[PDB]
Amino acid sequence: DEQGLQQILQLLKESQSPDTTIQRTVQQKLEQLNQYPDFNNYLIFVLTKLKSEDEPTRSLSGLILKNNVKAHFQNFPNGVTDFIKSECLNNIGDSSPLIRATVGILITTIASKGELQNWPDLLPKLCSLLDSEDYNTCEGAFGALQKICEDSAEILDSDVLDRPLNIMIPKFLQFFKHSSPKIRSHAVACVNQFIISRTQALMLHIDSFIENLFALAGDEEPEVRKNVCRALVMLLEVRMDRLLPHMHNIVEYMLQRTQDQDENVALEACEFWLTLAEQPICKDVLVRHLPKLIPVLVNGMKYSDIDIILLKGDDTISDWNLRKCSAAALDVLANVYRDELLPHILPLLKELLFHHEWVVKESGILVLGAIAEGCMQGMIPYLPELIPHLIQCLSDKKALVRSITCWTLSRYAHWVVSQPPDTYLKPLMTELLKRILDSNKRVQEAACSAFATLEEEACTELVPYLAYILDTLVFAFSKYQHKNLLILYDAIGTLADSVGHHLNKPEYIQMLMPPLIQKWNMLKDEDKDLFPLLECLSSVATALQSGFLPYCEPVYQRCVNLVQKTLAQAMLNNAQPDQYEAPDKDFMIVALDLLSGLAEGLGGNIEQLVARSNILTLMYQCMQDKMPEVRQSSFALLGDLTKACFQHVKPCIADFMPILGTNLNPEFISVCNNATWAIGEISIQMGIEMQPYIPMVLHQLVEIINRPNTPKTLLENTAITIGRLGYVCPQEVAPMLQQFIRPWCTSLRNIRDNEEKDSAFRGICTMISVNPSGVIQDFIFFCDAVASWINPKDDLRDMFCKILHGFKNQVGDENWRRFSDQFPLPLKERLAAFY
């Protein structure tokens, strides 16, 4: 503390040297000295007790200390920590603003990484320094308390410390009228941290808080209005009831603060419209202010002069701007007012899309895109004019105009594909393919994403141009960076999903596969760049089907290795977590999905590969995995392999079914769906041998059917599975026919007459023959299910007729008359004519 103190001071002066090499070499020393027990004893000493040396040196040591708290604080001796905690609280409100801010950031850091409860008398001291007549001590404590409330937004406790916000919050509200704007801004910032959290200490002061907010509403300092605006936005959700009286006064206030001097204030005031547009009373209040708000929102969607510099041209900007916030606000408002928003948009929109200034024109196109979803039914008449114009905007000289044009066109893709292909679709697809190979990297991703969107709405409408589409996409595999390669992977994979088996042509495979095999061979099993590639190949393998035969073996082998290694590393981590790290299961999930692609694509051709491999054992380990997505992907592989090669899956049914029966829990939808679908596919292959496995599966399935909410995809899948289960073993399914048939019929009556609908109904008829007692009570639903059929197969029709006539003979021609009269006309007439 005297013979080694100058040894550190010289390192502080040397660390401030303008030489780059000298800096990093000394910074390393302060890490090699950090491993000493009382090295941090010096850093805090220089900051507070060494008031002889210059300020930037004293500050630097305190900031080196701070970095020695954000790291290596787990090894911080309690004796030394007690020293720093005491010295900082002492020098709160130091004369030098540089030293004070250095001290303040130490307190907020120690209380952040190190926990708050480990510093007991932190809040009681800071909250008692707010009354100090020394302004610096007041600001220093208040500036720290703000960062504490931000870092510790929780620790509201309500029974952990003392609920310190019972004294702090009422004290905070008193500082809303303090002289200094810097103090007022602090006071409002602290309270705002406990608005959404429904703080009981603040909610019983909600009247004093709002009244104090109205006073600070017209403050000069923008940092005050910034916080006041944020507070009102938050109060719009949690305590809407206390704003209705002063509602229109606030809306006007927010409407001016949206056009505020400080853009920072303008953003927070703009979030008010997003919040308000999600409230039930929105469509009642804003109607008055609509003609005055709409142009303000649109005008804010223009590119600022700063953005046009960051975005070169005449992802380098923030995630949230005034532009994106106004775009979002206009998006949501469009879905609230629907077509009633058009009279406020269409006039100014007409004078925006054909404007000569590119900035003003670009913002106009964005407006057209934002209101697409909501005002769709009102924009359709204006589309035959706008759509051909936007396709021309794809050829604009400006880059930012071309990119936004791709996106706006993609939001009307549903209408374009509904129209004749050769008027909109063909020129749009052509011009969009041109922007994929654009010179500007930003326009590329915009078009490649827009094209991927176009492919989903068009599907088989792109089959004629499938050679034109592929030539552009494949060529794009040579001039694309790693950022846009992801979008390309999506566009290619989406194409295969859209055109389906139409992609299975020799000339297509000849150009589409070699670039994919290129990336395949250049990546190692640890590179996370495999995730987008194999997801793409999963769609391609499913589409190419048998055309994927010459590529199956090297793909199949590597996928098994990925799953096997991921599971092996998982076992190692489970045994010794300290020596072996946990593996990324995304490698396993992705590899399993590609295996499903092969099984679904090749079918029986994968039989030789499923055998001579341990994929069955690996799947058995994947189904037990903690991660639901892993279980989701493995169950999907089980079903696809059930159809492909059941002769290899059959010896493992005994241990598969109990796991399948366990994962019939609707908490994880996708897991429950794939499990249910797997059971159904297994039932077909088993036959009457499915008998012992039914009781541990059926009870869940019936529960899922009668279960409220739930997606239709799970209801349909559960009905088909039960139907397939009833077809193979009627004895163990028929007695419970009485209690699932009501939602069973309503679920399958809206499905087209396909194979899945056939096998399900073929089962409901089999367990109606056995125990017909269950269909009698709710026979109204079975009729509507049968009358939904247009062209059922002959044997299934005979089954329907034999059941309907059977019921008709049970009740008589007179009872059947009165019973059939409650049917709608087309349903009543169909049953009479068909059966």
Partner: peptide, 17 residues
């Protein structure tokens, strides 16, 4: 129809949908 649930969307597909 029913079948299996769609695969997990990645960064790109989720960004547009």
């Amino acid at each position: 129809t029913g079948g299996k649930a769609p695969r997990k969307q990645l960064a790109t597909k989720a960004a547009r949908k």
